[PDB]
Amino acid sequence: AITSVDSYLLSEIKPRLNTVLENCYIIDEVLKDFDYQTRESFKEAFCGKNAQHEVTVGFNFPKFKNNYEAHYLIQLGQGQETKNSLGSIQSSYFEATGDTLVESSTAIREDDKLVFTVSKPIGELIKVEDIEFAKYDNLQVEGNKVSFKYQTNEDYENYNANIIFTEKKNDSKGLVKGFTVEEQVTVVGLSFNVDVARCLDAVLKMILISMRDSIEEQQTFQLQNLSFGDIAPIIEDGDSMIFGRPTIIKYTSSLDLDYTITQDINKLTFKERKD
Amino acid sequence: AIQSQEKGTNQLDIGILDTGTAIGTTQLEKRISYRDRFTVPEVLMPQQ
Numbered sequence: 001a002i003t004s005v006d007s008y009l010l011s012e013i014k015p016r017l018n019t020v021l022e023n024c025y026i027i028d029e030v031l032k033d034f035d036y037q038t039r040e041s042f043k044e045a046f047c048g049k050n051a052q053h054e055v056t057v058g059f060n061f062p063k064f065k066n067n068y069e070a071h072y073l074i075q076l077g078q079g080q081e082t083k084n085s086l087g088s089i090q091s092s093y094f095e096a097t098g099d100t101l102v103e104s105s106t107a108i109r110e111d112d113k114l115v116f117t118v119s120k121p122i123g124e125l126i127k128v129e130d131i132e133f134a135k136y137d138n139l140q141v142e143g144n145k146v147s148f149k150y151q152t153n154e155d156y157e158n159y160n161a162n163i164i165f166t167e168k169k170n171d172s173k174g175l176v177k178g179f180t181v182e183e184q185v186t187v188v189g190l191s192f193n194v195d196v197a198r199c200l201d202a203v204l205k206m207i208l209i210s211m212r213d214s215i216e217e218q219q220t221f222q223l224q225n226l227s228f229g230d231i232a233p234i235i236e237d238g239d240s241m242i243f244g245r246p247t248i249i250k251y252t253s254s255l256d257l258d259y260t261i262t263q264d265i266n267k268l269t270f271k272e273r274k275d
Numbered sequence: 276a277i278q279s280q281e282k283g284t285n286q287l288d289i290g291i292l293d294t295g296t297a298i299g300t301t302q303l304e305k306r307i308s309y310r311d312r313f314t315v316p317e318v319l320m321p322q323q
Contacts, residue, residue: 060288060289061288063291064291065292073288073289075288190289237283237285238292238294
């Protein structure tokens, strides 16, 4: 599962950034340090659902024009290998497993059990929110649903819960081969007005923090290391310069591959020496 | 009067950008200032 860090940044940034700019209360917390003049002018421009101006994000070397009033620019950056493992082995699995998901569900009333239903086959369960199923509950999984017994849990026919689970594909057990990669990626905000750039960079730092709690970040992209450059004129051949402070993001992740095993031993016969 | 109207285009990481240059000749008794602005309604420029 080769990880495209650049795609992950875009997937996380685009929704979360829109949400942050949507409300004003969060922005005030973010821009608490800045002076009144810069803070409100930025808020007057981009903040709120009724903002006429809008921010954009894209990758480098596009053949079209970007909104140079305010824009996030990304470029892939360097990559390095840091740590290996014996035989390049990472893990062994009895089931072909995909991504790890979080889903919300409501308990359903069966005869002997209360069951939750999920959009896909459960495979490996990880956690149901704030439930410590005892052995007498007899927690078990079946297809796309998870079940626990009804008795002495009868108040919970309407229980509303979140579920963390994995996507199951096949029963073909296999090994993992791969290593760890230390990758760096560059991000920069652009504007023809320096004050906007500083506000824009500060907004970015917050959502990077929020990404530390994300499922993908916690499981796949770990050990953030942020580095900020000096504010510089990106462009000078024009009616006015473009100013932007580049930032560098570092990640640790695994470049993994699945190796499938077919040599399943089932029979075992003992024969003594003829002598 | 205007001469050598040029549309210089730079293809960059940030995108494409236009840095045109041109030379103007004015009338008498007119003093121009840095970063003054002119606009020519009659002339149209295509873009995509």
